[PDB]
Coordinates of C-alpha atoms in Angstrom, one line a residue:
Chain A
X39 CA 81.0 -142.9 123.1
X40 CA 79.0 -143.6 120.5
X41 CA 76.8 -146.1 122.0
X42 CA 76.0 -144.5 124.8
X43 CA 73.4 -141.6 125.8
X44 CA 74.6 -138.3 127.5
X45 CA 71.3 -136.6 128.9
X46 CA 68.1 -136.9 130.2
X47 CA 64.3 -135.9 129.0
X48 CA 62.8 -133.9 131.4
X49 CA 59.6 -132.0 130.5
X50 CA 58.0 -131.2 134.4
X51 CA 57.2 -127.7 136.0
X52 CA 58.2 -127.6 139.3
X53 CA 56.2 -125.5 141.7
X54 CA 58.4 -124.7 145.0
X55 CA 56.6 -122.2 147.6
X56 CA 59.6 -120.2 149.4
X57 CA 59.0 -117.7 151.7
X58 CA 56.2 -115.6 152.7
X59 CA 54.0 -116.3 149.4
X60 CA 56.7 -116.6 146.6
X61 CA 56.8 -119.6 144.4
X62 CA 59.5 -120.6 142.6
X63 CA 58.4 -122.1 139.0
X64 CA 60.9 -124.2 137.3
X65 CA 59.8 -124.7 133.5
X66 CA 61.8 -127.5 131.9
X67 CA 61.5 -127.9 127.9
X68 CA 63.2 -130.8 126.2
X69 CA 62.5 -131.1 122.5
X70 CA 64.1 -133.1 119.4
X71 CA 65.5 -130.7 117.1
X72 CA 65.9 -131.7 113.3
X73 CA 69.0 -129.9 112.0
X74 CA 69.2 -130.3 108.1
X75 CA 71.9 -129.4 106.0
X76 CA 72.5 -125.5 104.7
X77 CA 71.2 -124.8 101.3
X78 CA 74.7 -123.2 100.5
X79 CA 78.0 -123.1 102.8
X80 CA 78.3 -119.4 101.9
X81 CA 77.3 -116.0 103.6
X82 CA 75.1 -114.4 100.9
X83 CA 73.7 -110.9 100.5
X84 CA 70.4 -111.3 99.4
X85 CA 67.8 -108.6 98.3
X86 CA 64.1 -108.5 98.6
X87 CA 62.3 -106.1 96.2
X88 CA 58.7 -106.8 95.7
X89 CA 57.9 -104.4 92.9
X90 CA 54.7 -106.0 91.7
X91 CA 53.6 -104.8 95.3
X92 CA 55.0 -101.4 95.5
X93 CA 54.6 -100.7 91.6
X94 CA 50.9 -100.2 92.5
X95 CA 49.8 -97.1 93.6
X96 CA 48.5 -96.9 97.5
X97 CA 51.1 -99.8 98.4
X98 CA 53.5 -98.7 101.0
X99 CA 51.9 -100.4 103.5
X100 CA 52.7 -103.8 101.2
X101 CA 56.3 -102.7 101.4
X102 CA 58.8 -105.7 102.5
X103 CA 61.8 -104.7 100.4
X104 CA 64.9 -105.0 102.4
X105 CA 68.8 -106.9 102.2
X106 CA 69.5 -109.8 104.6
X107 CA 72.9 -111.9 105.3
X108 CA 71.8 -115.3 105.4
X109 CA 73.8 -117.4 107.4
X110 CA 74.5 -121.3 107.0
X111 CA 73.7 -121.2 110.8
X112 CA 70.4 -122.1 112.5
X113 CA 69.1 -120.8 115.5
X114 CA 67.8 -122.8 118.6
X115 CA 65.4 -120.1 119.9
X116 CA 63.4 -120.2 123.0
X117 CA 61.9 -117.5 124.1
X118 CA 58.6 -118.1 123.4
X119 CA 55.7 -119.0 126.3
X120 CA 54.1 -122.4 124.8
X121 CA 57.6 -124.2 124.7
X122 CA 58.1 -124.1 128.5
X123 CA 54.5 -124.2 130.1
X124 CA 51.2 -126.7 129.3
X125 CA 48.1 -124.7 128.8
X126 CA 47.2 -126.3 132.4
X127 CA 50.1 -124.6 134.1
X128 CA 49.3 -121.0 132.6
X129 CA 46.0 -121.4 133.9
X130 CA 47.2 -122.1 137.2
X131 CA 49.7 -119.3 136.9
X132 CA 47.3 -116.2 135.8
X133 CA 44.6 -117.3 138.1
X134 CA 46.7 -117.9 141.4
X135 CA 49.4 -115.8 140.9
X136 CA 49.7 -112.1 140.9
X137 CA 52.8 -110.9 139.4
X138 CA 55.8 -113.0 137.8
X139 CA 59.6 -112.2 137.4
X140 CA 62.3 -114.5 135.4
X141 CA 65.1 -115.9 137.0
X142 CA 67.8 -118.0 135.4
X143 CA 67.8 -120.0 132.5
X144 CA 69.8 -123.4 131.7
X145 CA 70.2 -124.8 128.2
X146 CA 72.0 -128.0 126.7
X147 CA 72.4 -130.1 123.6
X148 CA 72.8 -133.6 124.0
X149 CA 72.2 -136.9 121.8
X150 CA 73.5 -136.2 118.5
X151 CA 73.0 -138.2 115.9
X152 CA 73.8 -137.3 112.2
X153 CA 73.3 -139.5 109.2
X154 CA 73.7 -139.4 105.4
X155 CA 71.6 -140.6 102.6
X156 CA 72.3 -143.0 99.9
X157 CA 70.0 -144.2 96.7
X158 CA 69.1 -147.7 96.1
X159 CA 67.0 -149.3 93.4
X160 CA 65.2 -152.4 94.7
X161 CA 62.4 -152.3 92.3
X162 CA 63.7 -150.5 89.7
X163 CA 62.7 -146.6 91.4
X164 CA 65.2 -145.2 93.9
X165 CA 64.6 -145.4 97.6
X166 CA 66.6 -143.7 100.0
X167 CA 69.1 -145.2 102.4
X168 CA 70.0 -143.5 105.8
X169 CA 72.9 -144.6 107.2
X170 CA 75.1 -143.5 110.0
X171 CA 78.0 -141.0 110.3
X172 CA 79.8 -141.9 113.4
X173 CA 82.5 -139.0 112.9
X174 CA 80.9 -136.2 111.6
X175 CA 79.9 -133.5 114.0
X176 CA 77.8 -130.7 114.5
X177 CA 79.0 -126.8 115.3
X178 CA 77.7 -125.1 118.3
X179 CA 78.1 -121.8 119.6
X180 CA 76.3 -119.6 122.1
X181 CA 76.7 -115.7 121.5
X182 CA 76.9 -114.8 124.7
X183 CA 78.3 -111.5 124.4
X184 CA 75.6 -110.5 121.6
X185 CA 78.5 -109.6 119.4
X186 CA 76.2 -110.7 116.2
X187 CA 72.5 -109.1 115.9
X188 CA 69.8 -110.1 118.0
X189 CA 67.2 -111.7 115.4
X190 CA 64.2 -113.5 117.6
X191 CA 62.5 -116.2 115.8
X192 CA 59.3 -115.2 117.6
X193 CA 58.9 -112.7 115.3
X194 CA 58.7 -114.6 112.5
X195 CA 57.1 -117.5 114.8
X196 CA 60.0 -119.7 114.0
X197 CA 60.9 -120.6 117.5
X198 CA 60.7 -124.3 118.9
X199 CA 57.5 -126.4 118.9
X200 CA 55.0 -126.0 122.0
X201 CA 54.1 -129.9 121.9
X202 CA 56.6 -131.5 123.7
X203 CA 56.0 -135.1 122.0
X204 CA 56.5 -133.9 118.6
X205 CA 60.3 -133.3 116.8
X206 CA 60.9 -129.8 115.8
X207 CA 63.2 -127.8 113.4
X208 CA 65.4 -125.0 113.7
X209 CA 65.0 -121.9 112.4
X210 CA 67.8 -120.3 109.6
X211 CA 69.6 -117.2 111.2
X212 CA 69.7 -114.3 109.0
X213 CA 70.1 -110.6 110.0
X214 CA 69.6 -107.5 108.2
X215 CA 71.9 -105.5 106.2
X216 CA 71.8 -101.7 106.1
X217 CA 70.9 -100.0 102.7
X218 CA 68.9 -97.4 101.6
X219 CA 65.0 -97.6 100.7
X220 CA 63.1 -95.1 99.4
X221 CA 59.6 -94.9 98.4
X222 CA 57.1 -92.2 97.0
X223 CA 53.8 -91.9 99.1
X224 CA 50.7 -91.7 96.6
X225 CA 47.2 -93.0 97.2
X226 CA 45.1 -95.8 95.3
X227 CA 44.7 -95.2 91.3
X228 CA 46.4 -91.5 91.6
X229 CA 47.3 -89.9 88.6
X230 CA 50.6 -89.6 87.9
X231 CA 53.8 -92.4 88.5
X232 CA 55.4 -93.5 91.7
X233 CA 58.5 -91.3 91.9
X234 CA 60.5 -93.7 93.9
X235 CA 60.8 -97.0 94.1
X236 CA 64.9 -97.2 94.5
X237 CA 66.9 -99.2 96.3
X238 CA 70.6 -98.6 97.4
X239 CA 73.9 -99.7 97.1
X240 CA 76.0 -100.8 100.4
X241 CA 77.1 -97.4 101.9
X242 CA 81.0 -97.5 103.5
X243 CA 80.0 -95.6 106.8
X244 CA 77.4 -98.3 107.8
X245 CA 78.3 -101.9 106.8
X246 CA 78.2 -104.6 109.1
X247 CA 78.6 -108.2 107.4
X248 CA 79.4 -110.8 111.0
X249 CA 80.2 -114.1 110.4
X250 CA 80.0 -116.6 112.8
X251 CA 83.1 -118.3 112.4
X252 CA 85.3 -114.9 113.3
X253 CA 83.3 -114.0 116.1
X254 CA 82.4 -117.0 118.0
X255 CA 83.8 -119.9 120.1
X256 CA 82.3 -123.0 118.0
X257 CA 82.3 -126.3 119.9
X258 CA 82.1 -129.2 117.4
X259 CA 79.9 -132.3 118.8
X260 CA 80.0 -135.9 117.5
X261 CA 77.9 -138.4 118.6
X262 CA 79.4 -138.7 122.1
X263 CA 79.5 -135.4 122.9
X264 CA 77.1 -132.8 124.8
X265 CA 77.4 -129.0 125.2
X266 CA 75.7 -127.1 127.9
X267 CA 75.7 -123.6 128.3
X268 CA 75.2 -122.2 132.1
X269 CA 73.4 -120.4 134.1
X270 CA 72.2 -117.1 132.4
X271 CA 70.7 -115.3 135.3
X272 CA 68.0 -112.6 134.2
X273 CA 68.0 -109.1 135.3
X274 CA 64.5 -107.9 134.8
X275 CA 61.5 -106.2 136.0
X276 CA 58.6 -108.2 137.2
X277 CA 55.4 -108.3 134.9
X278 CA 51.6 -108.2 136.3
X279 CA 49.2 -111.1 136.5
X280 CA 46.5 -108.7 137.3
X281 CA 44.7 -106.4 135.0
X282 CA 43.3 -102.7 135.8
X283 CA 40.1 -101.2 135.1
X284 CA 39.9 -97.3 136.3
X285 CA 40.1 -95.1 133.9
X286 CA 40.7 -91.5 134.2
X287 CA 36.8 -91.0 135.3
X288 CA 37.1 -93.6 138.2
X289 CA 40.3 -92.2 140.2
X290 CA 39.8 -90.5 143.4
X291 CA 37.0 -90.0 146.1
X292 CA 33.7 -90.0 143.8
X293 CA 31.1 -87.2 144.8
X294 CA 28.7 -87.4 147.9
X295 CA 25.6 -88.4 147.2
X296 CA 23.0 -85.4 148.1
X297 CA 19.8 -88.0 147.7
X298 CA 19.6 -91.6 147.8
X299 CA 17.5 -94.1 146.0
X300 CA 14.8 -96.0 147.6
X301 CA 14.2 -99.1 145.3
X302 CA 16.8 -100.8 143.9
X303 CA 16.4 -99.3 140.2
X304 CA 16.5 -95.6 140.4
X305 CA 19.3 -93.6 140.9
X306 CA 20.9 -90.8 143.6
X307 CA 21.2 -87.5 142.2
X308 CA 24.3 -85.9 143.4
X309 CA 25.0 -82.2 144.9
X310 CA 23.8 -79.6 141.5
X311 CA 26.7 -78.4 139.8
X312 CA 26.8 -74.6 140.1
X313 CA 27.3 -75.7 144.5
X314 CA 29.4 -78.1 144.2
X315 CA 32.9 -78.5 146.0
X316 CA 36.0 -79.7 144.2
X317 CA 38.7 -78.5 141.7
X318 CA 38.8 -78.0 137.9
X319 CA 41.1 -76.8 135.6
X320 CA 38.2 -75.3 133.0
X321 CA 37.3 -71.6 134.0
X322 CA 33.3 -72.6 134.3
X323 CA 31.6 -71.6 137.8
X324 CA 30.7 -75.5 138.2
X325 CA 32.5 -78.5 139.0
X326 CA 31.4 -81.9 137.2
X327 CA 32.9 -85.6 136.7
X328 CA 34.4 -84.9 132.6
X329 CA 36.2 -81.9 134.1
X330 CA 37.1 -82.3 137.4
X331 CA 40.9 -82.5 138.2
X332 CA 42.6 -86.0 138.2
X333 CA 46.0 -87.1 139.7
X334 CA 47.3 -88.3 136.3
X335 CA 46.2 -89.4 132.9
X336 CA 45.7 -93.0 132.6
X337 CA 45.9 -94.0 129.0
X338 CA 47.3 -91.8 126.4
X339 CA 45.9 -90.9 122.5
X340 CA 48.3 -92.3 120.0
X341 CA 48.2 -91.6 115.8
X342 CA 46.6 -94.3 114.1
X343 CA 48.3 -96.1 111.1
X344 CA 51.5 -93.7 111.0
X345 CA 53.8 -94.9 108.0
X346 CA 57.1 -93.0 109.1
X347 CA 59.8 -93.4 106.7
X348 CA 63.9 -92.8 107.3
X349 CA 66.3 -94.3 105.1
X350 CA 64.7 -97.3 104.8
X351 CA 61.0 -97.7 103.8
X352 CA 57.4 -96.5 105.4
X353 CA 57.1 -98.5 108.6
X354 CA 54.5 -98.4 111.0
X355 CA 54.9 -96.5 114.1
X356 CA 54.4 -99.3 117.2
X357 CA 51.7 -98.7 119.2
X358 CA 51.0 -99.3 123.3
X359 CA 48.9 -102.0 123.4
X360 CA 45.6 -101.0 125.1
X361 CA 41.9 -102.1 125.9
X362 CA 39.2 -101.9 122.9
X363 CA 36.8 -99.9 124.3
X364 CA 32.9 -99.8 123.8
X365 CA 33.7 -98.2 120.5
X366 CA 34.7 -101.7 119.5
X367 CA 37.7 -100.7 116.9
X368 CA 40.7 -102.4 117.7
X369 CA 43.4 -100.5 115.5
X370 CA 43.3 -96.9 117.5
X371 CA 45.1 -98.7 120.6
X372 CA 47.0 -101.5 119.0
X373 CA 45.7 -104.9 119.1
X374 CA 48.4 -107.2 118.2
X375 CA 47.8 -109.2 115.0
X376 CA 49.3 -112.7 115.8
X377 CA 49.7 -115.6 112.6
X378 CA 51.1 -118.5 113.8
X379 CA 51.3 -121.8 112.1
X380 CA 51.1 -125.8 113.0
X381 CA 54.0 -125.9 114.9
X382 CA 52.5 -123.2 117.3
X383 CA 49.2 -123.6 117.4
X384 CA 47.1 -124.0 114.6
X385 CA 45.0 -126.9 114.4
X386 CA 46.5 -129.7 112.7
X387 CA 43.2 -130.8 110.2
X388 CA 43.4 -127.0 108.5
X389 CA 44.8 -128.5 105.0
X390 CA 44.9 -125.0 103.8
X391 CA 48.1 -122.9 103.0
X392 CA 46.5 -119.8 105.0
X393 CA 47.9 -119.4 108.9
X394 CA 45.7 -119.0 112.2
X395 CA 45.3 -115.5 113.1
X396 CA 44.5 -114.5 116.4
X397 CA 43.6 -110.5 117.4
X398 CA 44.8 -109.9 120.8
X399 CA 42.6 -107.5 122.6
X400 CA 44.1 -105.9 125.8
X401 CA 42.7 -106.2 129.1
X402 CA 43.7 -103.2 130.2
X403 CA 40.7 -101.4 130.7
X404 CA 41.8 -97.9 131.8
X405 CA 44.0 -97.1 129.1
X406 CA 41.5 -97.7 126.1
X407 CA 41.1 -95.0 123.8
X408 CA 37.2 -94.3 122.5
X409 CA 38.0 -92.7 119.2
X410 CA 34.7 -91.7 117.9
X411 CA 34.1 -90.2 121.8
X412 CA 36.5 -88.1 121.9
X413 CA 36.5 -84.3 121.3
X414 CA 38.2 -81.2 121.7
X415 CA 36.5 -77.4 122.7
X416 CA 38.0 -74.2 122.2
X417 CA 40.4 -72.8 124.8
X418 CA 37.4 -71.2 127.2
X419 CA 34.9 -73.7 127.9
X420 CA 31.5 -73.1 126.9
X421 CA 29.4 -76.0 126.7
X422 CA 27.3 -76.4 124.5
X423 CA 29.6 -75.3 122.2
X424 CA 29.0 -73.8 118.9
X425 CA 29.8 -75.9 115.1
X426 CA 33.1 -74.0 115.3
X427 CA 33.9 -74.5 118.8
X428 CA 34.3 -78.3 118.5
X429 CA 36.4 -80.5 116.8
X430 CA 34.7 -84.5 116.9
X431 CA 35.5 -87.2 115.1
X432 CA 33.8 -86.0 111.9
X433 CA 36.1 -83.3 110.5
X434 CA 38.6 -83.4 107.6
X435 CA 41.9 -82.9 108.8
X436 CA 43.5 -81.1 105.8
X437 CA 41.0 -81.9 102.9
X438 CA 41.0 -85.7 103.6
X439 CA 37.5 -86.8 105.0
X440 CA 38.8 -90.3 105.7
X441 CA 41.1 -88.7 108.2
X442 CA 39.9 -86.9 111.4
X443 CA 42.0 -85.3 114.2
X444 CA 42.4 -88.8 116.0
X445 CA 44.3 -90.2 113.5
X446 CA 47.3 -87.5 114.2
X447 CA 46.6 -86.5 118.2
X448 CA 49.3 -87.4 120.3
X449 CA 48.7 -86.7 123.9
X450 CA 51.9 -88.7 125.8
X451 CA 52.9 -86.2 128.3
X452 CA 54.3 -85.8 131.6
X453 CA 51.4 -87.0 134.0
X454 CA 50.5 -90.0 131.3
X455 CA 50.8 -93.4 133.7
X456 CA 50.0 -96.3 131.3
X457 CA 50.1 -100.3 132.2
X458 CA 52.5 -102.6 130.7
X459 CA 50.9 -105.2 128.3
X460 CA 50.1 -108.4 128.8
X461 CA 52.2 -112.0 128.0
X462 CA 50.7 -113.5 125.3
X463 CA 50.2 -117.2 125.7
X464 CA 52.0 -119.8 123.2
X465 CA 52.7 -117.6 120.4
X466 CA 54.1 -114.9 123.0
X467 CA 57.9 -113.6 123.5
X468 CA 59.4 -114.1 126.8
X469 CA 62.5 -111.6 126.8
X470 CA 64.3 -109.1 124.5
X471 CA 66.9 -107.4 124.3
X472 CA 67.7 -103.6 124.9
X473 CA 68.5 -101.6 121.8
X474 CA 71.7 -99.9 122.1
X475 CA 71.1 -96.1 122.0
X476 CA 71.6 -93.6 124.7
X477 CA 67.7 -93.1 125.6
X478 CA 66.0 -96.5 125.3
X479 CA 62.0 -96.9 125.2
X480 CA 60.0 -97.3 128.1
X481 CA 58.9 -100.9 127.2
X482 CA 59.2 -103.1 124.3
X483 CA 55.4 -104.5 123.1
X484 CA 57.2 -107.5 122.0
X485 CA 58.4 -109.3 125.1
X486 CA 57.3 -107.9 128.5
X487 CA 60.7 -109.1 130.1
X488 CA 63.5 -106.7 128.7
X489 CA 67.0 -108.0 130.0
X490 CA 68.4 -104.9 131.5
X491 CA 72.2 -105.7 131.5
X492 CA 72.6 -108.3 128.4
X493 CA 70.6 -110.7 126.6
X494 CA 70.9 -114.4 127.2
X495 CA 73.0 -115.8 124.0
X496 CA 71.4 -116.9 121.3
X497 CA 72.3 -120.3 120.2
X498 CA 73.8 -121.5 116.7
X499 CA 73.8 -124.4 115.3
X500 CA 74.6 -125.6 111.8
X501 CA 76.0 -129.3 110.5
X502 CA 80.0 -129.6 109.9
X503 CA 80.6 -130.3 106.0
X504 CA 80.7 -133.3 104.7
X505 CA 82.9 -133.8 101.7
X506 CA 83.4 -136.2 98.9
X507 CA 86.5 -137.1 97.6
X508 CA 86.7 -134.6 95.1
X509 CA 87.1 -131.3 96.2
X510 CA 88.6 -128.0 94.1
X511 CA 88.7 -124.9 96.0
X512 CA 89.2 -122.8 93.0
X513 CA 86.3 -124.2 91.8
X514 CA 82.7 -123.6 92.7
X515 CA 80.8 -126.9 93.0
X516 CA 80.9 -128.1 96.4
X517 CA 79.7 -132.1 96.0
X518 CA 78.9 -132.3 99.7
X519 CA 77.7 -136.0 100.8
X520 CA 73.7 -135.4 101.9
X521 CA 73.9 -135.4 105.6
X522 CA 71.7 -134.3 108.2
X523 CA 71.2 -134.6 111.8
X524 CA 68.9 -134.7 115.0
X525 CA 69.6 -133.7 118.5
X526 CA 68.1 -133.3 121.8
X527 CA 67.8 -129.6 123.5
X528 CA 67.4 -129.5 127.1
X529 CA 66.1 -126.0 128.7
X530 CA 65.7 -125.1 132.5
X531 CA 63.5 -121.8 133.1
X532 CA 63.2 -120.7 136.3
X533 CA 60.6 -118.2 137.4
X534 CA 59.5 -116.4 140.5
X535 CA 55.8 -115.5 141.2
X536 CA 54.0 -114.3 144.3
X537 CA 50.8 -115.6 145.6
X538 CA 47.4 -113.6 144.9
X539 CA 45.7 -112.1 148.0
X540 CA 41.4 -112.0 148.0
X541 CA 40.4 -108.6 149.4
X542 CA 37.1 -108.5 147.6
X543 CA 33.9 -109.6 148.4
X544 CA 32.7 -110.8 145.6
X545 CA 33.5 -114.0 143.3
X546 CA 36.6 -112.7 140.9
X547 CA 37.4 -113.5 137.2
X548 CA 39.0 -116.6 136.9
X549 CA 39.7 -118.6 133.7
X550 CA 38.0 -122.0 133.7
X551 CA 37.6 -124.8 130.9
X552 CA 33.9 -124.9 129.5
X553 CA 32.1 -127.8 128.0
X554 CA 32.0 -128.9 124.1
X555 CA 30.2 -126.0 122.5
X556 CA 30.8 -123.0 120.7
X557 CA 32.6 -121.0 124.0
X558 CA 36.0 -119.8 123.3
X559 CA 37.2 -122.0 126.0
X560 CA 35.7 -125.2 125.2
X561 CA 37.9 -128.3 126.4
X562 CA 38.1 -130.0 123.2
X563 CA 40.5 -127.5 121.7
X564 CA 42.8 -128.4 124.5
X565 CA 42.4 -132.3 124.0
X566 CA 43.8 -134.4 120.8
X567 CA 41.3 -135.7 118.4
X568 CA 40.5 -139.3 117.0
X569 CA 43.8 -138.8 114.5
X570 CA 45.9 -136.5 117.1
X571 CA 45.1 -133.2 115.9
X572 CA 46.5 -131.3 118.9
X573 CA 45.5 -127.3 118.9
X574 CA 46.8 -124.3 121.1
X575 CA 44.5 -121.0 121.2
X576 CA 45.7 -118.3 123.5
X577 CA 44.7 -118.1 127.2
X578 CA 44.2 -114.7 128.9
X579 CA 47.1 -113.7 131.0
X580 CA 45.3 -111.4 133.5
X581 CA 42.0 -112.5 134.8
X582 CA 41.7 -111.2 138.6
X583 CA 41.2 -107.2 138.3
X584 CA 43.7 -105.0 140.5
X585 CA 43.1 -101.5 141.7
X586 CA 44.8 -98.9 140.1
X587 CA 44.6 -95.8 142.6
Chain B
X246 CA 67.7 -60.9 139.8
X247 CA 70.7 -58.6 140.0
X248 CA 73.9 -60.4 141.1
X249 CA 77.1 -58.5 141.8
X250 CA 80.6 -60.6 141.1
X251 CA 81.9 -58.7 144.0
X252 CA 79.0 -59.7 146.5
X253 CA 78.8 -63.5 145.5
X254 CA 82.4 -64.9 145.3
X255 CA 85.7 -65.0 146.8
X256 CA 88.3 -62.7 144.5
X257 CA 91.7 -63.6 144.7
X258 CA 94.2 -60.5 143.6
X259 CA 96.9 -61.0 141.4
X260 CA 100.1 -59.4 140.9
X261 CA 102.8 -59.9 138.4
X262 CA 104.5 -62.4 141.2
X263 CA 101.1 -64.0 141.7
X264 CA 99.6 -67.2 140.8
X265 CA 95.8 -68.8 140.8
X266 CA 95.1 -72.2 140.7
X267 CA 91.7 -73.8 140.9
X268 CA 91.9 -77.3 141.6
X269 CA 90.5 -80.9 140.5
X270 CA 86.8 -80.4 139.9
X271 CA 85.8 -84.3 139.0
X272 CA 83.0 -84.7 136.7
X273 CA 79.9 -86.9 137.4
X274 CA 78.5 -86.7 133.8
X275 CA 77.7 -90.2 131.1
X276 CA 79.6 -91.2 128.5
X277 CA 78.7 -90.2 124.9
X278 CA 79.3 -93.0 122.2
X279 CA 81.7 -92.5 119.7
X280 CA 80.3 -95.3 117.1
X281 CA 77.0 -94.5 115.4
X282 CA 74.2 -96.0 114.3
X283 CA 72.4 -97.3 111.0
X284 CA 69.2 -99.6 112.2
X285 CA 66.1 -98.0 111.4
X286 CA 62.6 -99.2 112.4
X287 CA 62.5 -101.5 109.6
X288 CA 65.9 -103.2 110.8
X289 CA 65.0 -104.5 113.7
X290 CA 64.6 -108.3 114.8
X291 CA 65.0 -111.3 112.2
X292 CA 64.5 -111.1 108.8
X293 CA 61.5 -113.4 107.0
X294 CA 63.1 -116.1 105.7

């Protein structure tokens, strides 16, 4: 019926300790999604081509030229960590647990309301009247078989809101069309012209135009109807909530000290290098900590800002996130730069249109690479090497003195063992879909939980078309009574975690909330102001260090 | 490694009336896909609105 409710608001997180040190976290999230009517009722193939950027010589990284199919459907996409958990829950989980794993996901749509707007004068200046449409419906389809392309709204920072008391909106669904884009590489104010800035026609071999009407089972929902998509059971791998510190010079047995320090200030000299036991791979007749044989390489070097190009334009190749070293440079190890809005964590007192940005420096301290202090010697090791026997991060590669050997050096090999990148709080992404290729990547840097079997079916909502009395199908007018709707979305994400074990003598690192000041973890960020302007800055995921080897 | 086929195999002689039949070898391979891909690294994920 139209006057009875068909669900319950629930937002609590329930921890349940089951078994020998395993907690069952039951995160719940309920929001009021505000579905507006689509811009047009047609599937349109729109093309973006920023010639004002790419026409300037040197702007190949500023390219975002593409084509997209813009669907009239909106996406209820909930894979971000801030949707389900409050910051106290994330702090308790990251301090108290040792690993996290996803179990299951229930989703629900209830309390549907559709309203149409009208005009009245009342003063000579017309105002809107929001009547009620008890017979108009909204269309819901869950793509549980993943026919349609997988577009996460965590890519565009367009998921559900992170504050439960504020109503949120649904992101519009659109996917990529496969047309060819070619851009000619050129540097800043180079003499000459840009040879290639073209974009191609649709190709007959690879063109996929999907409609959501021909591919899905669409449920109509009036004001008394509810929708519930049942328990999708995850088949992911656990992520670890502890971080590592051991580099390649901190693996194995330390060398035994020949002399010991008398006071608390001086050091202890080891056995001299020429008469020291151990194994190396160089041909010198001495063993040292730098050239000692290790079990495996912990972090690999990766090429800095390599812009590859294959039938779509120049794109930067993704780097595995690692720690920024004492050599503070963040671009080499691939620290992800997040840019989010007021719905997702920006302080609401920011009147400017610029977003809130944050560089996520990784806490995997053994996998980080120091680029200024990396060097390559000649094939027989003769230290100290001459000038022509060493390649450092000062020598020009090719002829370019702005580019050194670290920009092109890839040292990913068979004995390379790196760590999985940490989940990012609120403006993260929980899960992903595995790429449909025969040889998969070892990891996704967008999400820690890549679904092995099938991703959860993405939810697509739209409003049913409300027509006026005048409707010509062969006339492109579409009068279309101005309707909108609000509905309630409730989801349940089940997770399984393990409790932390305390082996170290010293007090280990913890994420504590500090007092009001210039510190990063002051409480006044996580408290509303006098006008209620909340703010969510990210939290450290991996406070507690763990032993690699 | 000098291999001879006489010292290593079981050799069947076949005259004009004889037949040979080697039985069902059952494969244990992985499937190949008869569909091709088009998505580059600039066509993955959600397009910008």
